[PDB]
Scaffold this active site. Structure first.
Site, PDB file in Angstrom:
ATOM      1  N   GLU A 204       0.802  -1.219   0.000  1.00 10.81           N
ATOM      2  CA  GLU A 204       0.000   0.000   0.000  1.00 10.81           C
ATOM      3  C   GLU A 204       0.839   1.275   0.000  1.00 10.81           C
ATOM      4  OE1 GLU A 204      -2.372  -1.105   3.514  1.00 10.81           O
ATOM      5  OE2 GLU A 204      -4.102  -1.268   2.164  1.00 10.81           O
TER       6      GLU A 204
ATOM      7  N   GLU B  56      -3.760  -9.753   3.832  1.00 10.56           N
ATOM      8  CA  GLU B  56      -4.665  -9.447   4.946  1.00 10.56           C
ATOM      9  C   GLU B  56      -5.765 -10.486   5.173  1.00 10.56           C
ATOM     10  OE1 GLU B  56      -3.150  -7.100   3.222  1.00 10.56           O
ATOM     11  OE2 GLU B  56      -2.767  -5.335   4.451  1.00 10.56           O
TER      12      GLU B  56
END
Lengths: 252, 244, 252
Positions: free
Chosen positions: C106, C126
């Site tokens: 990210e 995740e």
């Protein structure tokens, strides 16, 4: 000699920027004449597809900066560079030979489909001269090729080869050098064989749908589909198919 | 029964079952599809759906109230909340392409084909193909396919990033199950929230996207699966999810 | 021993996450120092382009979960994970070695351009831990690679190799392992040679245009283009090109 040549072959309009000594750069004369050619294309019931090309083996080196700096009406209200701000309702194909740089990449991007000579090239070098591409290259480039590669090209000003633009899905068809117009004509003929009200409405949905919310997009699409269901062409297409014979379109 | 449904742990397999008509969609099919998507979204012990067609074809297109308002052709207008994988064999033309595009992930036989030929017959694709094809492959190739009506091979759709997985002809469903299993292994809430955010964010402005996302993130922070995932990792053992 | 190193090399700010020990994961100190460095990048007239990298063979393993668990202010209001919610105005290049996972992917996505070592890896795992990527990976990944591949990766949590991310158009440059930073510098230098106002406006337009409607986009762009027309750099670009010599930019 006109600064833009316009010629009809059957139902295709061929539009040629004709300043090969100025590398087909866009002055006010080109910008107005491109504008008028797109109007012609849209208005003329005998036409189905436009093709944009440049004379003398090169597409367009971009905006005529000298003409702009001196003050010509190069960037026309609600049209931009010829038609960058208002592309035509009917399909438009760019046929690219040589360089399509700066505003020239922008003109190509304002079309729907690109046919490019294997040896041709694109780019937005503006920043290298402390300029910014304002004919929609920065709006359309990231919508045609991967976002990060578009960013890269915009910030560096590097050229983007036709073969690389084809690999990235910006260029639809790669042609033999010298043969881009012929290949664009072949592509235009495939589209011209199809129902013109359906083609136009199909282009509209592809184009406009990016601006439609998830919640509204089917209803917005439906407003455009609505005249298709009862169109004469829609009924003809089904009749012909069931008659096992070719369809005959009227655009109604 | 013109649509079959089976549960495989956390997977729902939805099979169009009308091979005589090259698995085309009638009102029974459409209504049963919509029924199966609701079933998928309801059961907290289901994570992923798979859509396939019986007998070596996926779906030929439109075949009588086939287009359920607010839902479309089975689910074209409101696809399920949960992940959905198309398993494509043979021709998936016209409305069949639209069905495939309405799913999230496409697994296709190497010999299958897609396309929106509607303009060839003076028609326009109304099941979302025009909305979705340009989201899934490069804009100009989508435009080209839409205006010409030409076929798009499974191999080319794979090269363009529209087909996630090429499978052996006859084996698209098996590859789809393997893909689904890779997803049902993951936390049920986090999987669902993950699809939701990706889907909805397409329509969020840059200035609001993170706050819009945070609303979806919020119950994940305190969920039991979040704690379970943390416990399972240190302990170097597989997680036992609960979907809470 | 400081947890984020910041070095200037001429007009390039190099920003190195310096917690190799913890796989360069982001705790509250890294988060605030990243924001401070982005602020320095934008505020300093002698700076043109930032590079974001990680010390010790790894880019960034993601958010520091031990830090988040003990209640550190890791996700800073209005900034996020360092700068994920507010990237800088100037161009920013990720120089990626080893793993860039989870919040590390990210961070890389919040930059403009990615230079990745041939042997590096990305991904957003995740969901395998029952978590959800909240640092913008779910917002940005589907904007960088084909939509259904982004979807697939987010739901499976699979690694995306540097070679694949490059083929998909997410990674701009593959570098020799161990030499990602040097290739980022060479890329920075090409951008640094370009007109700084023009580069800044170019990035701005590409970034913001994603949210402008078809019928307002040209006018919103014009707002950003406006000072470019009369900037001293646009004039210097013309004169330097006329005289066939390197432009000397002032940012005015």
């Amino acid at each position: 000699e006109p600064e833009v040549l316009v010629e009809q072959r059957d139902r295709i309009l061929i539009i040629t920027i004709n300043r090969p000594k100025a590398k087909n750069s866009v002055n006010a004369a080109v910008s107005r004449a491109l504008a008028d050619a797109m109007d012609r294309l849209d208005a003329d019931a005998g036409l189905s597809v436009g093709i944009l090309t440049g004379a003398g083996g090169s597409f367009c080196a971009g905006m005529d900066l000298k003409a702009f700096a001196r003050g010509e009406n190069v960037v026309v209200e609600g049209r931009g560079l010829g038609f960058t701000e208002r592309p035509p309702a009917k399909p438009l194909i760019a046929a690219v030979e040589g360089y399509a740089l700066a505003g020239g990449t922008e003109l190509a991007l304002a079309t729907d489909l690109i046919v490019a000579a294997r040896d041709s090239a694109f780019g937005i070098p503006e920043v290298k001269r402390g300029l910014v591409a304002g004919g929609g290259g920065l709006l359309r480039l990231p919508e045609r090729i991967p976002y990060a590669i578009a960013m890269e090209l915009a910030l560096t000003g590097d050229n983007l080869s036709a073969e690389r633009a084809h690999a990235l899905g910006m260029v639809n068809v790669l042609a033999e050098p010298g043969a881009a117009l012929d290949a664009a004509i072949a592509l235009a003929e495939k589209i011209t064989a199809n129902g013109p009200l359906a083609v136009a409405a199909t282009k509209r949905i592809i184009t406009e749908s990016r601006g439609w919310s998830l919640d509204t997009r089917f209803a917005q699409q439906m407003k455009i589909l609505f005249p298709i269901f009862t169109s004469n062409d829609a009924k003809e297409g089904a009749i012909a198919f069931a008659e096992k014979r070719p369809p005959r379109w009227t655009g109604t």
